[PDB]
Symmetry: D2
Subunit: 443 residues, 4 copies
């Protein structure tokens, strides 16, 4: 229903990224325009992938959502929305079938399809294959001392051509970038977890071959990869390398998990920086460096069966090496394998591996580089973009028109809480964003 | 949305009973008239003084036995405003229920949801009306053809009789208590359906060492037996069952596809012999079975008695399996009742202060209620025959086409094990609205 | 420590079979001989070359269906050296098993536990011996009374016949494959009991798109159906069942009291009518049922196919309910058989490279084995009748009291649903040692 | 089979305390003397309580063990022992019935009965009702300057009379003592969790009275008390006061829990003090200030039901006050209720309560007072007892004979790991203790 804006027109809103966060904004805008639900803006979305896809590099077989399907992209804002997960199922003729599953945790493949089904209804306003590379200040009058729009430049991921689009307002919703240990070198055989399903098969084409494959880390991504490798490459020898002493379980308990409630964002944001830092630390185990207990137990059971076959752990096909860090990687010459050097992680062993899967998490700072050509518009003394409660970043008012602005989505954990980077509050936050950006225009 | 019809007018439809089945029809009619989602003269008569859902069995901790997705609207249209999720959103409780991580709300909570739905229809529901007669009406003195029905109800407070005229009747009156034959009439012999409303009046002192027997081994018997040991901590309770053990309900996913709304067509279109065979083979999904978790809790309570005393005969709370009651003897209120037991195979004497009889329900009450119109059935029929759309066969030479009677909730034999449950109410509500109002709504 | 008896001597007891039932007797005799806890001339004959527990069905990930406490000793004496926990302690694995927090070891692990037990009786077990007949013996040329038995066994690898003489015999030979009568004999039609041992030799290319059918809907059919989809990832598998659905086994605690060892006394004393009715009423504990967790796993795999394609007819792996096989075309050089299906209610065909037949077992094989002594039964018996202590009725005028035959594992009709399982083996082994050797040990 | 030594004789070993730690030693000595298990020392145990009892003040209805029954007092050392939990069940005629329970976690009540069954076989070497008060040095030749025995002085609970027993070797196995926040005054209405079942009923006799009852803390003891009070006093208003933001789940994941393995004691002890501290910190959530998830979920569901009835948390019968600390208690005067003053626990609110349950944990320092009169025998420069791997404390060899010594049990978490104070390694540690104390004597 949302109609396209011509590429060279002045947009009202341009969103960088079309993952769940921008999709929830698109959905919330649709719903706010729906006479059936409420009491058209010139909008477009740029997405570097060639079609909608949700962490496709980590769609390992059997992987599940880590959040109740009720926390979809609409329901917590309005269960009557056409964009609920249950309505998607009903449109697919699968609602009763999903009901008989008796699970709150769909396969990630299914929840990706739900979001693909939503995203297809916005295809007229999404430009796929466009990687935004810079955002530059615009002036309607060149002799004005005030920026009143932004030019967003994007690179065609197939041809390299640079496109430009003008917009009053920008949303940056680009998720995370791979965090690599600084000491690891670049090599086609060292692959971050985010590119597991998508590039490792190309590297290791023979599923029956006895590859040596190592996994670095001990959070959910590492555990899913380590566990999947033993099925994907049944004759491989896999090694899980972690600096902790053990995989530790994610905190799914209900009182702790109320920090993810949508209505907590007001209170979290109003707290002092010192309190927000302490709170995030105390609740870290709900999300970071932890594994769903059910997957830990599965891996533990697999280890036990190896113990039944051979009591000597050093002889096991699949091994966990706890409290170790990689200190050196040899990787030159035509030989297939790298030599990983391991030391204790407390305050030498070597391994010959065909590939090293690096499951060491994500950073959420890439908006600083994307926004570098407008960062002179920030107030003096800021080395970082500062979002208000409504996610609009602070601009020097002598330099930027009140009609122009930039909002950040998904990189605001420090100011808005641990739910900021997840699916947890997207339905409600998308509704807040539509009111913040479009509210006056709608009325 | 549904406006009252003056009590004197010729109604389009009168529904007898305002339990979940009739409520689902009201909701389906509301949704069919809702321009977001897509007036007849309708009224409902309910004997209870307000909406209430097996209030006599609202024992503490009792839970739904069916996923909340099978509420009164979602399987027909997840966008409906009458979904359980939207009810939670309207109550400010949606996020809190999400953190519960359960498909099975407390029965108390699901009653409040349906009561919240029911309040939307307060203009078209007359509470405290017990329907006692359905009378054939002939608007033409010069024709013996019946073209409407007069429904007579007795007000439970005044006892006055009121009459309403309607073209069509829905009979949606649930079940009546099934009692073993030959029990004496004694206020201390109480059917499970009146457990919460009658037993506390009879046994007022919660600390007294009452002897309380429970007859049966299905879900009602297990919930009552388990609850009595908490409600009367010093009581001596006895579960009497003719089976050798409580058996677990079948909640496995392939078997339970028989409850899918789209299976109604398939079940109906089978011969009487195959329908009868089907119901028998699948009986363990519903009848004479207990949810495994409750079985396990009762078993653990029994085990703890064994820890304290190895002699089962001296336990406070006991199960007497493979027993039948030969008679319940009484000598007035001055003394306990005496339950005489023998083997249920093709002996004990119990002295009790009350006998909870959890022996299930019959769904044949519509036969008495419709006795004054049964001469309009085709020659030879001794029971009402519903077609697929739930309308009973009438002799077409005796009843007009504008007049009809439908049955809801008593049609297991022709429509499947889901008929008496919540399982297909949302979808069946939609079909009923089509069958009864479809043309009227098309014009 | 059970010492061997010279083969030509007259044994006190000869046991046919060395599966868990006979093994539980050996363990109970060992424990009865141990003054720490509290020698007859005994020998066991086993057709397999070593101890093995349904090796043809040791599917990856398959689990015990009974708590490890019902091992081969604990319910009779938790102090026994032959408990599962002591075995783990001896293996250095007890703390590691504890951390699993499960009552259900892998079948592979429980087999190893019983193998560890069985290796301690190697002095009294002859493997590779298939018993073929039991013939009566009369040690007195002047009396017509049978007072011993000769057990004749064919060596598996040499085919040579050996004769062993014994006063008492135990038959503990488990079950035989039950096949639907209308199926023909073909290398591509394999009973579930030979899944792991026979199917790989027939279907050698783990990556080829075979069509593989599975007949039945009990635990065996479910385990094979689910496993085939991993073992042959490109196969098209089909579960053919005459019921409408896989149904869950009853593991609920009151019902499962029927497996309690002390229940055998009460069950045995019931009438034949009551025992038959009782067995029927409790059938869902054991027969034609699937553990709920596995049903749900199979259901979830079906659901994921529906996510990828809503048309069930085009799914890789399918279930075909309320079907019966009316005909199999298997003659010809074509690698695939054609299966003809009809409704099982009182024209579709499948072309398959193999049909796995998971249709259960019979436990009547002792009738053929004992045929040369069946004239010793009392008149008017067409079956062997076990007493409570598992000794079969013999005509007193024909058989001396110091001679007898006991049956193990085939007495469900008289001793209850626990008879064929591991459930009462520890306790039953103790009772058997008392019945067979009790007067001898006192 | 262990026979009494006359009270006035020189014992080989005297154990202070007869809880699970001392009982495990008694069991290991018995097994070491059994020719079945391995092909008599003068020993006595002194126990303050009148019979064996295992945290009887916290035997709340429904409380369960938090460790697999396989970790009983013998099995991990020798599954053949007559003192295993499975053998105890067999002796009681309950083994099959417990098997049908399908649980690794007996009721605490049942596990206490198991240990009482073990303890009663040592009744000839245990003096109950004896509170040890001091350990004093002994010189068999008083003119010499070498200590070669110890006199253990104990107060008879019934008569207060002091008796003295002499021994070469002493074991201190006295568990923990109630830890109270230093700011709380002494008052009969302020009760530590350790005395909940035994003292609170004496204080609040009428189970139907609407008492106000507060609970301080958020570990397992606070959760069990908070949950139990709501059943024990159905009309009470209970309040859980915690300085954390929420109850947090205990870590029962299997890799982490390998720290409780008996064979890990060697690994843990052989680490530096820095690394022992760091590791105890990393694994703290297995044991301290945490609650079993299933209990958290049950309390959460009870709170949810209150919310169904009334969305305003301030009106709930039972409430949780997070991030609070008690700053003042008013408790002088004849009024039934104390006034508790609360403030935020972050770096005006009052409650009036009939009682305050203090679930603030335990200290394990009480051995230092009992050994004060021998702490001059430590080597020069120690102000704390230093146990070696085999749990014997370091003595100055020029002052203490090699045939005399003191061992500590249960208070050595610092040096021996998180399992030290639990049942986790008692079977194995008992065997080790028998070898250390009586090894040469038996060989
Ligand atoms: C493997 C994995 C599984 C997860 N599972 C869950 C879960 O089950 N439940 C849950 O609540 N959360 C989960 N998360 C957390 C995750 O962050 C959210 O699920 C969600 O993806 C966040 O949405 P988003 O739109 O903020 O970020 P993303 O999903 O990362 O989306 C960002 C988008 O922007 C695009 N983009 C990036 N840079 C540019 C650019 N320069 N120009 C144009 N486009 C660009 C990317 O291609 C991407 O599509 C998971 C995270 C990972 C890594
Ligand atoms: C204790 C109990 C618990 C159950 N729990 C579940 C569950 O968790 N999930 C599930 O799917 N099903 C459950 N059921 C099955 C139950 O039948 C349905 O939940 C549902 O109540 C059926 O709805 P109904 O409108 O058909 O009948 P009812 O709910 O019985 O309602 C019929 C109505 O008609 C009224 N009535 C009867 N006679 C007259 C008259 N002469 N005049 C006027 N009014 C009359 C009654 O007062 C009542 O309000 C349960 C049944 C029982 C007994
Ligand atoms: C696939 C499968 C899985 C099962 N899993 C379980 C479980 O987890 N828990 C449970 O309680 N029960 C289980 N059962 C039931 C099973 O019957 C028992 O576990 C157990 O195997 C019975 O032991 P048995 O010794 O009486 O028979 P078996 O285990 O069958 O042993 C019989 C032995 O006799 C031998 N034999 C046969 N004929 C001769 C002959 N003529 N001469 C010499 N030797 C002969 C056989 O080789 C065999 O070794 C399972 C059954 C099957 C088929
Ligand atoms: C409420 C609670 C529940 C617990 N549940 C578990 C569990 O389920 N699993 C687990 O692994 N651990 C559990 N623990 C940990 C607990 O420490 C162990 O269960 C166990 O109690 C340790 O035994 P111990 O003998 O070292 O100390 P205790 O059990 O404390 O025994 C110490 C004994 O010494 C006696 N004593 C003390 N001082 C003197 C004196 N001066 N003179 C004479 N006698 C004295 C006491 O009377 C007492 O009997 C629990 C602890 C608590 C508080
Ligand atoms: N199925 C799903 O829904 C799914 C799947 C995957 C991930 N996720 C979610 O995505 C988010 C990220 O999870 P993640 O596992 O990818 O990342 P993560 O939680 O941040 O874990 C990163 C792991 O790598 C380690 N690590 C980080 N830097 C390291 C370094 N320089 N050297 C050595 N080790 C290092 C970390 O150890 P330290 O803690 O010591 O730094 C940790 O073990 C989580 O919220 C997760 O739940 C969800
Ligand atoms: Ca949860
Ligand atoms: Ca289910
Ligand atoms: Ca069970
Ligand atoms: Ca665990």
């Amino acid at each position: 229903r949302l109609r396209s804006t011509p590429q060279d027109e002045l947009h009202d809103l341009l969103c960088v990224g079309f993952g769940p966060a921008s999709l929830a904004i698109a959905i919330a805008l649709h719903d706010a325009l729906d006479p059936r639900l409420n009491k058209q803006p010139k909008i477009c979305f740029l997405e570097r992938q060639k079609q909608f896809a949700w962490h496709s590099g980590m769609l390992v077989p059997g992987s599940k959502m880590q959040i109740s399907f009720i926390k979809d992209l609409a329901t917590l804002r309005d269960p009557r929305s056409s964009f609920t997960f249950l309505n998607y199922l009903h449109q697919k003729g699968r609602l009763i079938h999903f009901t008989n599953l008796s699970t709150f945790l769909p396969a990630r493949l299914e929840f990706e399809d739900y979001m693909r089904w939503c995203a297809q209804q916005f295809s007229d306003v999404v430009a796929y294959g466009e990687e935004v590379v810079e955002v530059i200040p615009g002036k309607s009058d060149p002799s004005s001392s005030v920026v009143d729009f932004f030019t967003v430049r994007s690179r065609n991921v197939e041809t390299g051509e640079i496109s430009a689009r003008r917009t009053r307002k920008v949303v940056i919703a680009i998720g995370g970038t791979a965090k690599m240990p600084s000491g690891l070198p670049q090599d086609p055989r060292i692959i971050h977890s985010s590119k597991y399903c998508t590039t490792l098969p190309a590297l290791l084409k023979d599923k029956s071959k006895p590859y040596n494959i190592a996994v670095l880390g001990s959070g959910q991504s590492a555990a899913e990869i380590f566990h999947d490798l033993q099925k994907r490459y049944p004759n491989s020898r896999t090694t899980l390398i972690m600096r902790d002493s053990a995989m530790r379980p994610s905190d799914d308990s209900p009182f702790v998990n109320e920090i993810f409630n949508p209505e907590r964002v007001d209170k979290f944001y109003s707290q002092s920086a010192a309190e927000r830092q302490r709170s995030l630390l105390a609740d870290k185990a709900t999300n970071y460096s932890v594994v769903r207990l059910e997957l830990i137990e599965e891996i533990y059971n697999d280890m036990y069966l190896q113990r039944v076959k051979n009591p000597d752990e050093t002889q096991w096909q699949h091994r966990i090496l706890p409290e170790r860090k990689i200190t050196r990687v040899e990787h030159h010459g035509p030989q297939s394998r790298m030599r990983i050097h391991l030391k204790s992680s407390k305050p030498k062993e070597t391994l010959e591996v065909d590939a090293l899967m690096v499951a060491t998490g994500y950073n959420r700072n890439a908006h600083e580089r994307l926004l570098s050509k407008v960062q002179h518009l920030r107030p003096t003394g800021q080395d970082q973009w500062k979002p208000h409660r409504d996610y609009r970043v602070e601009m020097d008012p002598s330099k930027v028109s009140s009609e122009a602005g930039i909002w950040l989505q998904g990189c605001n954990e420090r100011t808005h809480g641990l739910s900021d980077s997840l699916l947890s509050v997207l339905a409600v936050r998308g509704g807040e964003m539509v009111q913040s950006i479009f509210g006056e225009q709608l009325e």
